[PDB]
Amino acid sequence: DVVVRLPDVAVPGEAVQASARQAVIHLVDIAGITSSTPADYATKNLYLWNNETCDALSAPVADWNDVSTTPTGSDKYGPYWVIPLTKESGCINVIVRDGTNKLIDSDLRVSFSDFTDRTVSVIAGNSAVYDSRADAFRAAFGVALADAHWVDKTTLLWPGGENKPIVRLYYSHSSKVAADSNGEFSDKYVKLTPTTVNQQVSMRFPHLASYPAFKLPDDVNVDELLQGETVAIAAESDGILSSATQVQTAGVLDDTYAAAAEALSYGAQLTDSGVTFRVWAPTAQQVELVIYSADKKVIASHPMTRDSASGAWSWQGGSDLKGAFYRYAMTVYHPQSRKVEQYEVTDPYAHSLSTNSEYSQVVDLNDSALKPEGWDGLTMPHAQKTKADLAKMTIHESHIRDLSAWDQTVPAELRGKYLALTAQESNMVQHLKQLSASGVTHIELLPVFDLATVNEFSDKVADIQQPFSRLCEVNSAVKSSEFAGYCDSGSTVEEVLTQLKQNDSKDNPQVQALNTLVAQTDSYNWGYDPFHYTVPEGSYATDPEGTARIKEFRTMIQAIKQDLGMNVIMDVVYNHTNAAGPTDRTSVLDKIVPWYYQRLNETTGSVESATCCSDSAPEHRMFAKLIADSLAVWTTDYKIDGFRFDLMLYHPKAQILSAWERIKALNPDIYFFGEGWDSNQSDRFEIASQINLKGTGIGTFSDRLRDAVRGGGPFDSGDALRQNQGVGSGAGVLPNELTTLSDDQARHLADLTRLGMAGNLADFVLIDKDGAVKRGSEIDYNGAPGGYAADPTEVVNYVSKHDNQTLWDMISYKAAQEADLDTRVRMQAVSLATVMLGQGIAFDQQGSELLRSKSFTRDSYDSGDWFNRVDYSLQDNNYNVGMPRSSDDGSNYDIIARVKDAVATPGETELKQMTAFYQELTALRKSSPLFTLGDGATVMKRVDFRNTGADQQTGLLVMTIDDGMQAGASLDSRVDGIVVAINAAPESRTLQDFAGTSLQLSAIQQAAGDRSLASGVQVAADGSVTLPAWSVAVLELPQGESQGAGLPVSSK
Ligand SMILES: OC[C@H]1O[C@H](O[C@H]2[C@H](O)[C@@H](O)[C@@H](O)O[C@@H]2CO)[C@H](O)[C@@H](O)[C@@H]1O
Ligand SMILES: OC[C@H]1O[C@H](O[C@H]2[C@H](O)[C@@H](O)[C@@H](O)O[C@@H]2CO)[C@H](O)[C@@H](O)[C@@H]1O
Ligand SMILES: [Ca+2]
Ligand SMILES: [Ca+2]
Ligand SMILES: [Ca+2]
Ligand SMILES: [Ca+2]
Ligand SMILES: [Ca+2]
């Protein structure tokens, strides 16, 4: 059993020792064995200086651009320097360079008291100072990276151990493994022997299936090794170390503890007998439950009891702990810092919290005191049982502050709060009530779980409605900025921003300049920054301390369903955490079970950030359980009707489906949907994407109709924003001065739009732009198959969302100069019509009915009340209120300045006009079951299109929905068929397709008179129908005594 040791055999000696009044410094340069000629260390030099601290240097270098401090000499182990000294006592500061750069990113202090010989050595890319070149040398053979994966009880996967004679797994309980003084590894260890990856491991971690496999003895005490640091080391026959790296243990943790741990319940569980606390921490050395008083003083610290089979820790107490604050005191090794950390953490299964989430709190959500009157009997206003039920879903995506921050008719104390929804007299609530009466069925809420990016301590926050003096007191960045002069003015921040507007331009973006500072300490953020997954956000409650927020959240939910008549969908963000590591305030999960809840890079062990932040690992069993347990609470205790999964594509398809199975047992009608783009995680598992979820019943946002109607894509910048016109903005038919879009390209977008109005089904058959018969999957969408769904209920169509530019801002970027204000309002309505009158589920951004603008801001997550403003007093749409954030839209300033003032800014006249158009569309959507068939096969048997092929009139979309004898049963007793005609063009168009068929304009549109989207439409005696420019008409075939012939789908 050779004793692994650092390469001490061929270690460098000492080029030279220091004499009198001189300090020698070595730069050990690992020269390859083939070193045939002394490398050129001519460009090598140091930077000397003797400030207040160290002043032993004798006439140090002055300029930083002085590279004459070249080496005094060199050998086969690097160059060395002989620094003159005035005193052989004290220290000196140096910076090893290779020219102008810093060979070492750090200042070095050569303490003579630490090195009496005053002869040190340094390593390239090292921060420590060694006493000899031999030490620095062996130092370059220490532990690096973490490409070793302990995936199961007896399997280790590690590249660096391939072919190496000696492969072992060393471990230390309380210390960091490393060669001792001598230079040999004397720590305890277990011998590994080459093996082949089994079928089980290959299936669990496909992306590691080709890694060199190593086997561990069956009698190894895994539990003990997982208590401290573990390191994989490789060495030759002589026992010399070739490489040593850290080990990722998520895999073995699941294989050892997951099944037993999955069978238990977690959090502070208050029941009859009392309370039982349980937290999963399989690697912790110790765990104590710390109880705090209301004033946050420690009342007691109880060591918990560890269950060997599960790795969970528990503690049982009396029911008198109800309402108590607590945290878990951890003693655990964290691989990132390579140290046994000691810290207090909140409960990841927390169901209540103190202000700003500093302490978790024991709570019983079933408590009547935490429920509004009549809560238990709260019913779901809209059905979600059958596919036809689901298809009627019409979503209004909203944000707590966007809704009431600016409404003066909402009581001041409730602005930006959950309770604003209960102010029935306010403009905002009355507006939502009317939208509901008109056909909007669901309210989707941006992050209302506990987010981390807003300080819940009110005295640390300042909003634009408050004095500029308050902003200066809570924000030091402002106090040291160019706006500091406003600190002692008597103006509010909003008043200052308003006066800055006149002189604001691309050359002086002063509005966003000030707002960027305001954003750091205000109450605003979308909230895609998870702190705790199963506790409501505290800043949206009137009182963030304790359980109060729970009852207030429920009061809001009740108000929406009972008083507004709409179902509620919650946006969830399980794909990432706000932070990881052993030090960040918001790192919870990664502090309790380090390296388990986060997805890590296979080689470095660093937490990935593809999501934006700290990527989570839903593929790990206990996080999948946390997610499902969390969704169960929101479903049962908060009565949420559906969930929108943020970046669902980063979750395994199997995990999302398993979670749905679990929740359906609680609420059989719950609906799941989310972003199913490409997460690039396919190498690790089958992702929950648009393609993979086909036929599962899980919905996904469709980017097909979205891009075809809006024009362009979410990554466009500069002139591309104007060049890429959409069907909704006149592609081909009303070109602007920059576009080069051909008629063919415009018709391809129309193919995508028609396919989307039919549910974006993979098997739907249509006639494309060239007159060819094509299935939905055959219509191209940037190289990918267009149609991907099995049922229209698996598709969520939309033309505006919180992400990216608003619909109005896109139309402003793309509309031709000659399209006047009135025309642009109709373009917004025409664009929304493709969604509202389509078979897919309808989704829209709060405010599209008010021509909402963000002053061109593309990503407004932290742009505050100013750029996210929605005026329910209907004075304007927030357009032209200053150039957007330069950090993300600066490259768009030129194009913005060019298109911004083309027409006037919408006023009350235009806003009222748009709301009417909007409610007309939603009212039409629900006026007949034909608009929402739900089932794919039924859509294929009843839906067809006219005005298709090479001889089509560009921009005119004509869809027919059959209810005649050839379709089967009559689903609508008032009609034998319906015709949807959208004329997205500046010309009047005449349809001869239904001559002599007795077609009639919908009663709903007739009733709107000249305020209808169909104003001016004429149904002639000869049966022909003429539509004016930018109009929408819904026509119907009145049903007689029996089922008529209807509008049979044409054979293709
Ligand atoms: O604060 C994190 C992150 O939030 C936003 O990004 C979200 C986006 O809004 C969601 O629709 C989805 O794409 O997930 C993203 C990450 O959670 C902001 O857009 C982004 O700037 C910010 O960093
Ligand atoms: O937060 C991620 C990212 O999501 C969206 O981008 C999608 C895009 O919408 C899809 O059409 C397709 O290209 O995949 C993209 C993600 O890879 C948002 O549009 C974007 O703003 C956001 O950053
Ligand atoms: Ca020395
Ligand atoms: Ca919070
Ligand atoms: Ca903010
Ligand atoms: Ca990867
Ligand atoms: Ca009928």
List Cβ neighbours of 718 (8 Å cut-off, separation of 6 or more).
Answer: 891, 892, 894, 895
Terminus-to-terminus CA distance in the chain, angstroms? 78
Which amino acid would we find at residue 439?
Answer: G
Q: CA Rg, the chain, in Å?
A: 34
Which amino acid would we find at residue 768?
Answer: D
Angle at 974 between CA 973 and CA 976, to 5 degrees: 85
What dihedral angle (degrees, nearest 10) is formed by the CA atoms of 662, 664, 667, 670? 120
Protein residue whose Cα sits closest to atom 11 of ligand 1: 803
Distance CA(816)–CA(696), nearest Å, equals: 43
For residue 108, what are its two tokens? 């070095």
Kindly tell me the sign of the dihedral angle through the C-alpha atoms of 776, 778, 784, 790: positive
> Ligand 2 centre from 1030 Cα, in Å?
30
Domain 245-363, second-level architecture? Sandwich (2.60)
List Cβ neighbours of 466 (8 Å cut-off, separation of 6 or more).
Answer: 492, 493
CB 868 within 8 A of CB 846: no
> Ligand 4 centre from 559 Cα, in Å?
23
**Nearest to residue 444, comparing CAs of 699, 705, 714, 802?**
802
Distance CA(961)–CA(944), nearest Å, equals: 7
CA distances from 410 to 422, 568, 850, 864 (A): 9, 21, 19, 19
CA distances from 641 to 231, 652, 937 (A): 48, 23, 26
CB 537 within 8 A of CB 451: yes
CA max distance for the chain: 117
DSSP secondary structure string, 223-292? Answer: HHHTTSEEEEEEE-TT-BEEEEEEEE-HHHHIIIIIHHHHTS--EEEE-SS-EEEEEE-TT-SEEEEEEE
CB 93 within 8 A of CB 130: no
Angle at 38 between CA 37 and CA 40, to 5 degrees: 120
What string of H, E and C letters represents the secondary structure of 984-1026? Answer: CCCCCEEECCCCCCCCEECHHHHHCHHHCCCCCCEECCCCCEE
Phi, psi angle pair for 977, to nearest 5°? 175, 160
- Ligand 2 atom with the smallest distance to the CA of 678 is 17
Q: Which listed residue (255, 675, 871, 962) is catalytic? A: 675
User: 364-943: which CATH topology?
Assistant: TIM Barrel (3.20.20)
Best residue among 528, 575, 805 to mutate for probing ligand 1's pocket (most ligand atoms within 8 Å of CB) is 528
- Residue listed under structure tokens 């549109």: 1005
CB 455 within 8 A of CB 901: no
Distance CA(515)–CA(525), nearest Å, equals: 13
> Ligand 2 centre from 679 Cα, in Å?
10
Protein residue whose Cα sits closest to atom 17 of ligand 1: 528
CA distances from 752 to 513, 571, 708, 774 (A): 40, 28, 6, 12
Distance CA(329)–CA(304), nearest Å, equals: 10
The yes-or-no answer on residue 646 being catalytic is yes
Best residue among 646, 724, 803 to mutate for probing ligand 2's pocket (most ligand atoms within 8 Å of CB) is 803
Q: Residue 84 forms beta bridges with which residues?
A: 22
Angle at 984 between CA 925 and CA 1033, to 5 degrees: 40
CB 1033 within 8 A of CB 1019: no
For residue 828, what are its two tokens? 């917004």
The yes-or-no answer on residue 450 being catalytic is no
CB 720 within 8 A of CB 712: yes
For residue 1019, what are its two tokens? 């149904």
Protein residue whose Cα sits closest to atom 7 of ligand 2: 677
CB 931 within 8 A of CB 1004: no
The alpha carbon of residue 53 and the mean position of all alpha carbons in its chain are separated, in whole angstroms, by 47
Distance CA(969)–CA(512), nearest Å, equals: 59
For residue 630, what are its two tokens? 């969390």
Distance CA(209)–CA(106), nearest Å, equals: 40
CATH tag, 944-1052: 2.60.40.1180
> Ligand 3 centre from 116 Cα, in Å?
8
Domain boundaries, the chain: 1-130, 131-244, 245-363, 364-943, 944-1052
DSSP secondary structure string, 108-157? Answer: EE--TTT-TT-EEEEETT--S-BSSHHHHHHHTTSB----EEEEETTEEE
Kindly tell me the sign of the dihedral angle through the C-alpha atoms of 153, 157, 161, 162: positive
> Ligand 2 centre from 539 Cα, in Å?
29
Distance CA(345)–CA(325), nearest Å, equals: 12
Is 328 exposed, middle or buried (CB count within 10 Å of its CB: 0-12, 13-18, 19+)? buried
Distance CA(412)–CA(406), nearest Å, equals: 10
Phi, psi angle pair for 250, to nearest 5°? -55, -45
Best residue among 675, 677, 797 to mutate for probing ligand 2's pocket (most ligand atoms within 8 Å of CB) is 677
> Ligand 1 centre from 574 Cα, in Å?
12
Distance CA(332)–CA(339), nearest Å, equals: 8
Which amino acid would we find at residue 909?
Answer: T
Q: Which listed residue (552, 608, 646, 910) is catalytic? A: 646
CA distances from 687 to 631, 647, 671, 791 (A): 20, 11, 19, 20
Q: Is residue 747 within a helix (H) or strand (E), and if so which, with residue range?
A: helix 743-757
Superfamily of 131-244 according to CATH: Rab geranylgeranyltransferase alpha-subunit, insert domain (2.60.40.1130)
| Smallest-distance ligand from the CA of 26 | 3
CB 999 within 8 A of CB 1023: yes
For residue 904, what are its two tokens? 């006037």
DSSP assignment letter at 962: E
| Smallest-distance ligand from the CA of 135 | 3
Helix (H, G, I), strand (E, B) or coil at 930: helix
Distance CA(308)–CA(223), nearest Å, equals: 8
> Ligand 7 centre from 838 Cα, in Å?
19
- For 266-291, give one letter per residue: b (16+ CB within 10 A) or e: bbbbbeeeebbbbbbbbbbbebbbbb
DSSP assignment letter at 343: E
Give the pocket of ligand 1 (CB within 6 Å). 526, 528-529, 573, 611-613, 646-647, 803, 859, 861
**Nearest to residue 923, comparing CAs of 591, 540, 441, 455?**
441
Query: Ligand 4 (ion): which residues have CB within 5 A?
Result: 450-451, 538
What string of H, E and C letters represents the secondary structure of 43-85? Answer: CCECCCECCCCCCCECCCCCCCCCCCCCCCEEECCEEEEEEEE
Angle at 676 between CA 673 and CA 679, to 5 degrees: 140
- Ligand 2 atom with the smallest distance to the CA of 713 is 11
Distance CA(1013)–CA(914), nearest Å, equals: 10
Which amino acid would we find at residue 181?
Answer: S
- Residue listed under structure tokens 């986060």: 598
CB 572 within 8 A of CB 578: no
Q: How many CB atoms lie within 10 A of CB 87?
A: 11
User: 1-130: which CATH topology?
Assistant: Immunoglobulin-like (2.60.40)
Best residue among 702, 703, 781 to mutate for probing ligand 2's pocket (most ligand atoms within 8 Å of CB) is 703
List Cβ neighbours of 114 (8 Å cut-off, separation of 6 or more).
Answer: none
Give the pocket of ligand 2 (CB within 6 Å). 677, 703, 714, 803-804
Method: X-ray
Helix (H, G, I), strand (E, B) or coil at 396: strand
Phi, psi angle pair for 94, to nearest 5°? -140, 160
Is 632 exposed, middle or buried (CB count within 10 Å of its CB: 0-12, 13-18, 19+)? middle
For residue 279, what are its two tokens? 């937290």
Helix (H, G, I), strand (E, B) or coil at 1032: strand
DSSP assignment letter at 875: S
Q: Are strands 394-398 and 442-445 parallel, antiparallel or unpaired?
A: parallel
For residue 51, what are its two tokens? 């400030």
* Within this chain, domains 1-130 and 944-1052 share the same CATH topology: yes
What dihedral angle (degrees, nearest 10) is formed by the CA atoms of 614, 619, 622, 627? 70
Q: Is residue 499 within a helix (H) or strand (E), and if so which, with residue range?
A: helix 493-500
Phi-psi region of 769 (alpha: psi -120 to 50; beta: other; left: phi over 0): alpha
- Ligand 2 atom with the smallest distance to the CA of 714 is 19
